[PDB]
UniProtKB/Swiss-Prot annotation:
Assembly with partners or alone: Part of the aCascade ribonucleoprotein complex, minimally composed of Csa2 and Cas5a, which binds crRNA. Other possible components of aCascade in strain P1 are Cas6b (SSO1437) and Csa5 (SSO1443), while SSO1399, Cas5b (SSO1400) and SSO1401 have sometimes been seen weakly associated. Csa2 is probably the major RNA-binding subunit. The Csa2-Cas5a-crRNA complex also binds target DNA homologous to crRNA, probably forming an R-loop. Purified aCascade forms a filament about 6 nm in width.
Name of this protein: CRISPR system aCascade subunit Cas5 1
Domain of life: Archaea
Protein task: CRISPR (clustered regularly interspaced short palindromic repeat) is an adaptive immune system that provides protection against mobile genetic elements (viruses, transposable elements and conjugative plasmids). CRISPR clusters contain spacers, sequences complementary to antecedent mobile elements, and target invading nucleic acids. CRISPR clusters are transcribed and processed into CRISPR RNA (crRNA).
Organismal lineage: Archaea, Thermoproteota, Thermoprotei, Sulfolobales, Sulfolobaceae
Something else known: Cloning was done with strain P2, while interaction experiments were done with genes cloned from strain P2 but over-expressed in P1. The aCascade complex was purified from strain P1.
Family, as annotated: Belongs to the CRISPR-associated protein Cas5 family. Subtype I-A/Apern subfamily.
Signal peptide: none
Keyword Ribonucleoprotein: no
Origin species: Saccharolobus solfataricus (strain ATCC 35092 / DSM 1617 / JCM 11322 / P2) (Sulfolobus solfataricus)
NCBIfam families recorded: cas_cas5a, CRISPR_cas5
GO biological-process terms attached to the record: defense response to virus
Keyword list, A-Z: Antiviral defense, RNA-binding
Length: 211
RNA sequence: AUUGAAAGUUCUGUUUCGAAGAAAACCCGCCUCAGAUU
């Protein structure tokens, strides 16, 4: 199981509108991160024949694990929800085993935006390595699933609804999955939360929790 | 190529016309550059 870290500098912020008044999300979903990763290889094509229906040029990277977190302060504003965090930093962690280190690093250096067109984002540095799996009590900053238990004080937890990869095909709605975010609503920032969990990869001290 | 792909809240308008900081008032009343030298 290999892992990679990437540091992104944002220009003005990101904007992803909730499916189904147009409120937005607080942090990008894993689908957006996987698509941003896949952009490095599938650049220039917008419709590929999956075999039965044209749904997206991204239904092939669906088995890559990804998380992300903030490192600065920003504000969520509706005026079409947006998250303004100019000149901020975003740290993204990719954990997978499908491709070798070289391919993942090459695709990691090839990220241009997160969400819509305006949300450009530069790349400052990357790291590649091998991760280890543990199950003891850990402290994390990246968001995780709803089913994961919690030992600390419930003070900085929020609930959001994300979708699986099934939504990659047009004319179809993805399955709803609950997620827990360790975020302060105003102003936006990230806080550490201690969890027990069952699977957690050590990617440099900042343990990442998946289940 | 990411609930992503496609979208100008844009066009038109004077803060304008008029109204003396003006009239009265001494700086002024006394004081040696003076005694000695071819």
């Amino acid at each position: 199981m290999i892992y990679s870290k990437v540091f992104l500098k944002l220009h003005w912020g990101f904007s992803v509108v909730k499916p189904l008044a147009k409120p937005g999300f607080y942090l990008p979903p894993p689908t957006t991160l996987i698509g941003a990763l896949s952009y490095g290889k599938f650049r220039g094509v917008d419709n590929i024949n999956l075999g039965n229906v044209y749904g997206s040029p991204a239904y092939n990277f669906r088995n890559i694990m990804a998380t992300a977190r903030l490192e600065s302060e920003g504000v969520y504003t509706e005026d079409t929800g947006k998250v303004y965090i100019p000149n901020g930093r975003l740290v993204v962690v990719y954990v997978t085993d499908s491709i070798s280190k070289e391919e993942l690093e090459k695709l990691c250096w090839s990220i241009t935006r997160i969400g819509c067109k305006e949300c450009l984002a530069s790349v400052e540095n990357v790291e590649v390595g091998e991760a280890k799996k543990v199950s003891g009590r850990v402290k994390t900053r990246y968001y995780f699933r709803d089913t994961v238990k919690v030992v600390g004080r419930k003070e900085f937890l929020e609930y959001v609804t994300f979708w699986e990869e099934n939504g990659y095909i047009w004319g179809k709605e993805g399955s709803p999955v609950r997620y827990i975010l360790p975020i302060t609503t105003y102003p936006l920032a990230s806080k550490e939360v201690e969890v027990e969990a069952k699977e957690a990869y050590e990617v440099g001290g900042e343990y990442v929790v998946f289940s």
